[PDB]
Design an enzyme around this catalytic site. Structure first.
Site, mmCIF file in Angstrom:
data_model
loop_
_atom_site.group_PDB
_atom_site.id
_atom_site.type_symbol
_atom_site.label_atom_id
_atom_site.label_comp_id
_atom_site.label_asym_id
_atom_site.label_seq_id
_atom_site.Cartn_x
_atom_site.Cartn_y
_atom_site.Cartn_z
ATOM 1 N N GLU A 165 10.218 -0.153 -4.714
ATOM 2 C CA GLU A 165 10.005 0.180 -6.043
ATOM 3 C C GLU A 165 10.897 0.978 -6.739
ATOM 4 O O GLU A 165 10.752 2.174 -6.949
ATOM 5 C CB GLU A 165 8.709 0.854 -6.261
ATOM 6 C CG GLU A 165 7.485 0.157 -5.660
ATOM 7 C CD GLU A 165 6.088 0.645 -5.738
ATOM 8 O OE1 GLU A 165 6.112 1.910 -6.537
ATOM 9 O OE2 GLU A 165 4.901 0.243 -5.342
ATOM 10 N N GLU A 354 2.749 -4.328 -0.119
ATOM 11 C CA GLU A 354 1.736 -3.788 -0.564
ATOM 12 C C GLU A 354 0.867 -4.471 -1.604
ATOM 13 O O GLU A 354 1.413 -4.915 -2.512
ATOM 14 C CB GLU A 354 2.004 -2.312 -1.444
ATOM 15 C CG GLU A 354 3.002 -1.211 -0.713
ATOM 16 C CD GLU A 354 3.327 -0.137 -1.566
ATOM 17 O OE1 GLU A 354 2.546 0.366 -2.464
ATOM 18 O OE2 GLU A 354 4.344 0.450 -1.410
#
Lengths: 449, 449
Positions: A165, A354
């Protein structure tokens, strides 16, 4: 009707190094920007820290025994750079290698498949004193640390993730400054975004020079951005949001270019930075899959009042049930995103690094966590994961965030994504019912929707 | 009238580890309470830190060459506990030992005499996580680190100091919380004072047992406390000061007791603590000299408004010239003190671990510091140092604070005690006329006042 996933489909669960490990100053680990950001008043909720957290650094035997009890086929975890180089570069701390060497070899022996992330936000605090990710030199030092991990663990670890991220790092960490390292400058935030992607390029390039028999990728933060109304200004306001957000890192990696509509937005506020043309070829370096982290979806409207030219459509979002984080629940939002990644980046191999949710847990009078909502959330999203595979998507893996209740960054320990409850005062694990559910889902390779 | 000091008299200058060394996270050094306290907003002036400072860690060759170019016969310096033990106890760090081994050997080979302080405030932050000085177990760890230093540097190194100004550590660091580790609780401030003294005792008791051919002592913060007027309430107010301040540490070390008048002040606000009353025999352990650090003198008046029962007599103090610190100049306030330690504690051997002054320095158009005031200050105080030796006092050594301009704790780099100017952008030394003065004062012994 019974949903069944591909026979070869890898089920997994994910965690991050700072979030679970603890032992923040043990066995020669250098300080990280998070150690430093966590120690200063006003940053973390309730003045929490990641000093102890789940203490996974000492209790990893107990965790693996749990992981195998549930019987996950792949454990995605992060390597702490500061445990491998306390000073970012130079003197190798052999203690910090050995820990991760040991851990990986206990996974392989317990028939669990390792999935390493090389940068999950730590950055040694010594590189942050020489500018951090703004100093391009950090992109080389990332490659040095990448090198040492590949030598040791290269072949025996199938799935690699360069970065987690980078979107949140640059945005929250370097513009909004509510993540580490707490910087608040827009120009810097865009220099870092580049320097991060470049660092991913350099790792893949090195990963091919060494010729490691394993698959590498990048874990991006990705949601679908739906227009507020099917009207020219709102469809365009959404396409600019997704561009500033997730397409800013998707397009350089997979199309070797930055999104134009976004770039135009930056220059209209009198900011250009001349990315060397060679760097984008180095970022674009072919990769074996794209991985992404999804939880919710965004509903954008046109807004001249925000200098962006758009804002969230809170009118629409107040029609969905919300997770504890305040984020809407919208399962189909996953499907459309998978289809967007399919129908814009050449039917690539997809992984889900995720997906999970945060609900207020209690231990009841029965000594059990009956988190029916988490279970509901999970199976709803996983029905749309299946739906996408049926309609021709190449989704090869699903990693549940998270295995353990952990340190949720600026929220502290006030939010629980775990399927294994962790009491932060006693460090006792109690496998949630969303844990026992997941176990059966892996075994049956699905569930009856 | 020309003054000449004894022919044996040792001239020296003094620095501290965190104030000059820098390299705050290099070669395995663990974090200190100061590293931590510096990195938090609202603690240090202008957000200054000791991260780099004078960078003495790397530029010590240059600094010895200067030390030898000027006379000084002994260099008093501090060892960083976190360089030796990053975790306070357990794993060595041989790179930290070798630095101080190498430094000392270069001092012995340049015909300068080493004077080591074992604790100059940089407690390893790991021990601060287990309660720090308030956890008695830190007084045992202190002894462990002391052991390792004595083994390696014991017999070479003639002068030792167990602690620097434990009066400030406990008062500023643990009651006012404007020093590290920033704690603000009275009770805790006295428990630490005791634990610090105890740690001194244990080190001296371990010293000898090992049979190190050298002299040990303790460097205490010490002024004189004059009454505002020759009246029964003011004389008594002044006695109660001193007793809280310097006598609190003098009496336990040299008499084996705590000052009564002070203890009575602490029980009058409902605070006792059971001193195991055999620790006090361990604290009182004979010691080869008493060292202290003087700069100014206090003028106390009776004050029922201050819950202390006294305050500064500002009416009087506004009749002296003041240093850049705001402290009065009063040279004779050294003499009277040197007579008070000589009378009341059995004519001990006395060392001055620190004296010096902070005035606004400029580099003139001639590229030279003309700090006439620092030189004035110096010779004014040294004349009263001499006067005390003539009137019987056993004053064996004078160490000038400070050799270099350094990190002056909560004041940052805004204050300069140095006789060697340091530019904290370039790290260039320019010896400060006060320096050149002190070179002649060492060579011809004294000076013609």
């Amino acid at each position: 009707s019974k949903i069944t996933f591909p026979k070869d489909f890898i089920w997994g669960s994910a965690t991050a190094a700072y979030q679970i490990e603890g032992a923040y100053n043990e066995d020669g680990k250098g300080e990280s920007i998070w150690d430093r950001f966590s120690h200063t008043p006003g940053n973390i909720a309730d003045g929490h820290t990641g000093d102890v957290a789940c203490d996974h650094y000492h209790r990893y035997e107990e965790d693996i025994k749990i992981m195998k009890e549930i019987g996950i086929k792949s454990y995605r975890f992060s390597i702490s750079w500061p445990r491998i180089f306390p000073e970012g570069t130079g003197k190798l701390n052999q203690k910090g290698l050995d820990f991760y060497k040991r851990l990986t070899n206990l996974l392989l022996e317990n028939g669990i498949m390792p999935a390493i992330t090389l940068y999950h936000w730590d950055l040694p605090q010594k590189l942050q004193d020489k500018g951090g990710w703004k100093n391009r030199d950090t992109t080389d030092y990332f490659t040095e640390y990448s090198e040492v991990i590949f030598k040791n663990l290269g072949d025996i670890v199938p799935i690699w993730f360069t970065h987690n991220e980078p979107g949140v790092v640059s945005l929250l960490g370097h513009f909004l400054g509510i993540h580490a390292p707490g910087i608040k400058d827009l120009r810097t935030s865009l220099e870092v975004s580049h320097n991060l992607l470049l660092s991913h390029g350099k790792a893949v390039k090195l990963f091919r020079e060494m010729n490691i028999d394993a698959q590498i990728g990048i874990a991006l933060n990705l949601s679908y951005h739906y227009p507020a109304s099917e009207k020219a200004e709102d469809i365009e306001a959404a396409e600019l949001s997704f561009s500033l957000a997730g397409r800013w890192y998707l397009d350089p990696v997979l199309k070797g270019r930055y999104p134009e509509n976004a770039l135009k937005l930056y220059k209209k506020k009198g900011i250009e930075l001349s990315f060397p043309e060679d760097d984008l070829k180095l970022i674009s370096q072919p990769i074996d899959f794209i991985a992404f982290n999804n939880y919710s979806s965004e509903f954008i409207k046109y807004d001249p009042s925000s200098e962006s030219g758009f804002s969230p459509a809170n009118s629409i979002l107040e029609k969905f049930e919300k997770t504890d984080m305040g984020w809407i629940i919208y399962p189909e939002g996953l499907y459309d995103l998978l289809m967007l990644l399919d129908r814009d980046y050449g039917k690539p191999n997809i992984v889900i690094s995720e997906n999970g949710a945060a609900f207020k847990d209690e231990i009841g009078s029965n000594g059990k966590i009956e988190d029916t909502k988490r279970i509901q959330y999970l199976k709803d999203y996983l029905t749309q994961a299946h739906r996408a595979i049926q309609d021709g998507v190449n989704l090869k893996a699903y990693y549940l965030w998270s295995l353990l209740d952990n340190f949720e960054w600026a929220y502290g320990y006030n939010k629980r994504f775990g399927i294994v409850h962790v009491n932060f005062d006693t460090l006792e694990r109690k496998i949630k019912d969303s844990g026992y559910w997941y176990k059966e889902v892996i075994k049956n390779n699905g569930f009856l929707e």
